Design a protein around this ligand. Structure first.
Ligand SMILES: CC(C)[C@@H](N)C(=O)NS(=O)(=O)OC[C@H]1O[C@@H](n2cnc3c(N)ncnc32)[C@H](O)[C@@H]1O
Ligand SMILES: CC(C)[C@@H](N)C(=O)NS(=O)(=O)OC[C@H]1O[C@@H](n2cnc3c(N)ncnc32)[C@H](O)[C@@H]1O
Lengths: 288, 278
């Protein structure tokens, strides 16, 4: 096997390497935590890291890979922020012991051959205009799960539809891994932290508070029912300078069609100039 | 707590979590878990897979029996009896509802080979096969998984699954078991009337002739097989194709595979054979 130095950051590029190291560690009793990322790490990613780190006797594997398969059209791929130096320094600071940084050739030696076909949820919301996006995501996440074989895998609630689809993947293929959702990390004014936030100028940055404002307003209005919750969110988004709403939708927590008046998730996607922002929140209908 | 396991006896589990728990406990005790996926109605062709799995030192054999609705009689008690007689220690016999508790939701989409040959008449067949095999691999987590060369295209697509999804299992293909005259063993053979069963020998005869004709090249191999099939009455050839061993285009020399499918009345038969060109 390759070398592993405990209490140090170990960086592996080869899938076989991180696989052997993970397998070895699992036999020594350490529980293996996996945090899949596309790099450009910020505080939101670090909350997943810290959630992983908190599991007693955990070894934390953070993968960094920009997956060509989940990008669909033009140059979303070439436009994705890549800050690899900073990424490894943050992981060192967090006391993460393993970074997995595979090449495209190592992940896709045969191009797109066998792939994962998600359920119908992948055609909705984010999947609407990007009908192959989630197939890309679930395919890469399945591969990472098989390479690393973790006990638990960590995803943010910020990408709630992704989190849900990953739960379906784990259930539907009988994967032996626990999926842990981690609450969204927000700036001081409520803005959901995202790498995309850097594409916002100072005007747009100011208008952007509206997504989380609309959602939290909705969450409190919801004592008055679903229509009140939705109308409150919409009013806030309409009061906001140059925020173009793509969707604002209230669903059950599994992203089915809402109960009558139960527990749910309110999701929004909006454009500020060229920058598409996402946010979501837990909603309880008729409950203070 | 781990379900009861009695060594040297046939232990039957219907719940995925149960066989998962048992397989995990056994590997920890120094056993090597071998998986043999079947749809039951076992014959000597299936038992060859079993015997291959058994001879691995330290092996514990898991035979799954599950009829996939995603990819016609049944004998549960007789199947279990055969496994008992082979000395298999675990049979996994789940229900459709246990395997598919949420219906068909996430599935495996095979590569383009799935659209070819057997995927011609049945264009969603291999999607069903790869999905269920992926599920059984995750449930049992075997060290090795066994498939017959009889279903060569199936075997090749399973190797593609294992490669593409980085699965940590060895895929072992087991030679086709044949009747005394060379007909590949299949439950479908019993449906053949005496004339059809006589004519059916032409598939295997055609392929072995080709394998021997191939010292004279690719075209001589193909022409030999076609002549043999042309000498049989009531044999409707669906395809006869020579490909490389991974089922790509045949290279000019080197190793190949010759595959045939044909219909004798209502019964469809398949066969294939290794070929070495020149
Ligand atoms: C690799 C695969 C999972 C890919 N589709 C992906 O989402 N890559 S990612 O780098 O954009 O994000 C990695 C993880 O960080 C999570 N994340 C991002 N921002 C936040 C935040 N503000 N609060 C909490 N969690 C967050 C995000 O939901 C995801 O689970
Ligand atoms: C579950 C999945 C594998 C499913 N598609 C399937 O094939 N079920 S099956 O019961 O019909 O086949 C079980 C296994 O037995 C193998 N098999 C059958 N006949 C023979 C034979 N004559 N010689 C060698 N091997 C043989 C067959 O190729 C397969 O790997």
């Amino acid at each position: 096997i390759p070398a592993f130095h405990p209490g140090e950051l170990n960086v592996y590029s080869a899938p076989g390497d991180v696989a052997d190291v993970s397998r070895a560690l699992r036999l020594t009793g350490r529980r293996v935590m996996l945090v899949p990322t596309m790099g450009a790490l910020h505080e939101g990613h670090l909350a997943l890291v810290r959630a992983a780190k908190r599991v007693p006797g955990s070894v934390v594997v953070v993968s960094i890979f920009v997956n060509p398969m989940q990008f669909g059209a033009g140059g979303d791929l070439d436009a994705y922020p890549r800050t690899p130096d900073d990424d490894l320094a943050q992981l060192r600071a967090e006391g993460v012991e393993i970074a997995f940084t595979p090449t495209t050739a190592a992940m896709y030696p045969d191009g797109l051959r066998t792939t994962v076909q998600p359920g119908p949820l992948a055609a909705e919301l984010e999947g609407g205009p990007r009908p192959t996006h989630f197939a890309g995501v679930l395919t890469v996440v399945l591969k990472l799960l098989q390479i690393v074989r973790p006990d638990r895998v960590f995803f943010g609630e910020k990408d709630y539809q992704q989190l849900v689809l990953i739960r379906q993947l784990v259930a539907d293929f009988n994967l032996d891994v626990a999926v842990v959702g981690v609450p969204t990390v927000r700036e001081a004014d409520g803005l959901a932290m995202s790498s995309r936030n850097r594409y916002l100028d100072p005007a747009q940055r100011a208008a952007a508070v509206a997504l989380s404002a609309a959602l939290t307003a909705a969450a409190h209005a919801a004592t008055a029912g679903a229509q009140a919750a939705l109308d409150a969110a919409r009013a806030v988004l309409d009061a906001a300078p140059g925020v173009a709403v793509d969707y604002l939708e209230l669903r059950d927590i599994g992203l089915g069609p809402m109960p009558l008046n139960g527990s749910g998730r309110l999701l929004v996607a909006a454009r500020l100039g060229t920058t598409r922002l996402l946010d979501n929140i837990a909603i309880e209908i008729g409950t203070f």
